[PDB]
Amino acid sequence: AVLEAPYDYIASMPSKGVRDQFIDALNDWLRVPVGKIKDAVRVLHNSSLLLDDFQDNSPLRRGKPSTHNIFGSAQTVNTATYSIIKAIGQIMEFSAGESVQEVMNSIMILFQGQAMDLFWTYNGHVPSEEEYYRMIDQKTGQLFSIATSLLLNAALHRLTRLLGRCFQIRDDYQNLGKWSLALIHMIRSHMALLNVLSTGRKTLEQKQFVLDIIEEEKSLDYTRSVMMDLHVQLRAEIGRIEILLDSPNPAMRLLLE
Amino acid sequence: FEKAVLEAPYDYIASMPSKGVRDQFIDALNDWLRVPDVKVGKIKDAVRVLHNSSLLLDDFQDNSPLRRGKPSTHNIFGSAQTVNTATYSIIKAIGQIMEFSAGESVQEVMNSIMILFQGQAMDLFWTYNGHVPSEEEYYRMIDQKTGQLFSIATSLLLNALHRLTRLLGRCFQIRDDYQNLALIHMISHMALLNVLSTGRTLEQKQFVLDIIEEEKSLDYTRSVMMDLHVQLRAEIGRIEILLDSPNPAMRLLLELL
Amino acid sequence: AVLEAPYDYIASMPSKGVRDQFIDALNDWLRVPKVGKIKDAVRVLHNSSLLLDDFQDNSPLRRGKPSTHNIFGSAQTVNTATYSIIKAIGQIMEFSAGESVQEVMNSIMILFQGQAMDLFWTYNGHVPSEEEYYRMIDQKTGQLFSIATSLLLNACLHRLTRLLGRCFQIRDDYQNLALIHMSHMALLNVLSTGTLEQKQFVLDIIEEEKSLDYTRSVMMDLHVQLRAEIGRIEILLDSPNPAMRLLLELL
Amino acid sequence: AVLEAPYDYIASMPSKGVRDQFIDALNDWLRVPKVGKIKDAVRVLHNSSLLLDDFQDNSPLRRGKPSTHNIFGSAQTVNTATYSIIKAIGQIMEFSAGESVQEVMNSIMILFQGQAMDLFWTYNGHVPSEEEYYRMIDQKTGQLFSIATSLLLNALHRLTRLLGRCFQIRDDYQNLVGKWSLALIHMIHKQRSHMALLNVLSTGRGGMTLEQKQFVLDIIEEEKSLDYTRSVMMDLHVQLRAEIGRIEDSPNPAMRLLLELLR
To answer: Out of the domains of life, which is the source (chain A)?
Structure first.
């Protein structure tokens, strides 16, 4: 009731879910007899969204007030911690085989990635290409790993890795502070951008400068170029599994991608 | 650098000097139950991780910049980072219990942890909303928030006394108010509730301070702890004589006042 | 490259491009090659002065992208500005020999003197006269041109620089000497920091007096006198002057 | 008149000058008679650098008198600082004008490189290493001694560069009792309290609260990082006392007197 109220608010927010297709897509050729896996996964994602909205203050989520602006910062965090443990207990109910110790690490590594992101945006340590890809896989691609691992046992990991990275690159791609592939790769003029970010830490004219420097560097094309490389390799990954050729890959043909 | 970022706030709290009351209680109960030395160590540290994580959370929810030794963890690392490690440390604690401390009765450990959050949520809801406690559900509220940590320690030791762990937790939390129920035993009545609002001003505190010294509520509260200890003595004896040997380590611990 | 970063940022902006026309114009008469050293040595001095000048008046926007004062902080811009001037002195030493470089430094010594008076007037409440402002004009915008001509000459024309230099700063000021002209007593009292009404009032009192025509009057009379002077030197060396005779870009 | 106003204010303020005693103590070896132009030219350079750094670090009080930028403003202080350097160079030109004046300029050239690195680390959050801080100190403070000794030699440099390091560490040591100090780098690299201090410094840089300042004061004295300064300060003195001994080809009682004054 009172404890589960912050979680209940998020469930009413328009889901536009993307993981449920992925489990259904993996179920297509796995013939697993599904809901119990999805609902446990969904609680984890809802809690993860609930936490991150508080961590990075955003007045609105999708046109509606944020959970920490109407429920209080203290109450939202308590429900978020409670939600994860409820999901963990649910998973253990049907995961006697393949001891839940394996599912334990996937949750733990998930918090490892989110810790690295928060450290970088607090102490200002600029990331690199390899370092950023390590955090992006841990924070986002681990959720798909949990669903894939559960589905396989109750009856490919590289498929989740490639797909997991693409969604979080999407997150920074359509968004345009927090680091991004476009901003990281851009850093002709690099010293100018470094001092601008440090200045803004402690400014509308400067906000004009940063947006302009992306246009001249045209790093958005670079994100598009990397994104196409991901699709082709995963397309081979889809085709490499040829036991069932009837998979229509509808997630790949999503309109906005 | 991987684990250091994630565990930076936890070892900050683990380095604090603490009274170590929980270690005394688990050592006291071990003499009754004759628990092997190896399992006692794992139980003590698993409980210790949970307590430190709760301390990390409680500091952020209830803003307490002052803290023994060095300042609070949300003024030393940041609000975002301390919450992330608090959740991570809890999940590692559960996995630690599952790995060796518990074989096939892990469900009750999750159940005892789950109710622990429900009591904390109720307390936070009262503070934010402002609804006054009813002076009766506060005992049930304080049982869930503190007495469950004693219960989780007792339950693991038993599988490797029920009334004792519920009573001692109740007395322990009510002690902290005395050293710093008193605010709620008073509710003279209608004037206090009206003056409580609109400033939740200097004379209002003095009026509150004045009405303390006339009703002597803190003295009624003083008496609470005293009788609580005697209530605990009953259990010690009851078990001491039930147990082949009358382990009196708890009797020495009972001089907690 | 952090030291040179604020200077390079202000050099990425495509500048007005006037000294290059002037140094190329003068080289038409004096067949001296070396000019590239003169071109960039003066360029370093002007950009470094621009870095300093922008900081002192707290200009929040030079052209388009924000100024160096708002990007690298006040500390780094000043350090880079001071470092670039001494480097500019160094480049002159390598080619321009001794004494020549000493006289060269006397101009830069003088050039900072004129800038000091302007800041003193802006900071301490003071009123200038026409004579005082005219001297301040020469010491700031005319010393840079004098350096450029002096280096070219040794590798008269001095009167040309002070006439052309005086025009360029008053021409840029015209994009707003008008306030130097000035009833006068009423305007002086509000000039001492007294509020939008007084900003309106001063606008009418200068528009109704047609000080813009007065500023244009100094523009025209100074230019026509110079046009005789430039021809005077162009016949001394018997030159048609196909390039310097282009003074209509600054009109 | 008004151009010399801020420099004269900082030149009339008397302070314990050690760069002055370096020249005449060194002159006891070289016996070069002109030290009058050498001593004052270095003084103008040092005073000019002082005006810049005061505005650069926003120092409220130099030693009790109001800061030069708090009475004349930031605009005039920078203008008079740049002009003073040019005059200081002009004084140096009057002697040895035939050549070797490029030696003076590259000494001034490298001086600004060190201050830029110090500013860049302060404005951003680039934590320095032990090697990085040592080379920056040499090229920021120890270079002013190197230019002074070079002109005297024209009319040993190992002594001057290493004397610069000892002098600046004392100032950094005296500074503590948000820039960088040798205590900060030494404890950052060590395992204990590495992450805690790194987050605290980023937290203040918006400023550090009273409790947080106490924490930073608490950690330094408990890890003997303040004791680490005397570890490298005293050792440095011993090896320097050998360097002066080996060059001397006449007895020099003067330079030893300077060493005991330092510590």
So the answer is: Eukaryota
